[PDB]
Design a protein around this ligand. Structure first.
Ligand code: UN9
Ligand code: MN
Length: 224
């Protein structure tokens, strides 16, 4: 589907109504599987971190580690299809310009590729941007073939503010997710019992990001 039909007929109205929007079959099986292959090669050649320290045991051989990450620009060798994914995310956001809230999105982060190793670890409940750092939209792409949450867990559970219910999103192959990054969407990753990959990009609102630079004042200018 053109980034445009999807953006204008589904993503824009969904984000303004619900703030949480799922697109399945974003890139297709061939491109999705190539991204999966690039991510697995990154993992298998040791490009990820060792994982979030979960239990700091007295003996370190007993330390439990969780989600592993790596930051990907998209131009690295063997990340070209990841870069294609990122360009496709950018195309979608660009076709939403001036329709996502009142936000104006001119910049994003690099991609954070995450691997939950499948050892029962998840990710605690949190808000992506609780303190106004500029991030207004969180975009996650999943690449887990035939994921069965009843068996492997790993559901993303979101707790939409003001609503007495949560929204459970399975980390399905070739699924793209958008949600507001601020306190509207506290969320958690339930324990994952199989290897679980995701690629996240955050989009900045230009105003919020510009004034965030005041708080984090960071390179300066010489006086004398
Ligand atoms: O993977 C998912 O479905 C959702 N993941 C996250 O919400 C998530 N959020 C943050 Cl802020 C981090 C931050 C660092 C590493 C992994 C993260 C993560 O998986
Ligand atoms: Mn998060």
């Amino acid at each position: 589907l053109p980034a445009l039909k999807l953006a204008l007929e589904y993503i824009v109205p969904c984000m303004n109504k619900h703030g949480i929007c799922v697109v399945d079959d974003f890139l297709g099986k061939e491109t999705g599987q190539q991204i999966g292959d690039e991510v697995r090669a990154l993992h298998d050649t040791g490009k990820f971190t060792d994982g979030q320290l979960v239990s700091q045991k007295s003996d370190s051989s007993k330390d439990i580690r969780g989600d592993k990450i790596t930051w990907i620009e998209g131009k690295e060798p063997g990340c070209e299809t990841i870069g294609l994914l990122m360009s496709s995310m950018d195309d979608l956001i660009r076709h939403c310009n001036g329709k996502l809230g009142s936000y104006k999105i001119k910049e994003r982060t690099k991609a954070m590729v995450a691997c939950y190793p499948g050892n029962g670890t998840g990710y605690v409940r949190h808000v992506d941007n609780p303190n106004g750092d500029g991030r207004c939209v969180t975009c996650i792409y999943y690449l887990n073939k035939d994921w069965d949450a009843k068996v492997s867990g790993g559901i993303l559970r979101i707790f939409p503010e003001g609503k007495a219910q949560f929204a459970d999103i399975e980390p399905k192959f070739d699924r793209l997710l958008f949600f507001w990054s601020d306190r509207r969407n506290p969320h958690e990753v339930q324990p994952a019992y199989a290897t679980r990959y995701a690629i996240t990009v955050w989009y900045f609102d230009a105003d919020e990001r510009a004034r965030a630079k005041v708080k984090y004042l960071e390179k300066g200018v010489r006086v004398e």
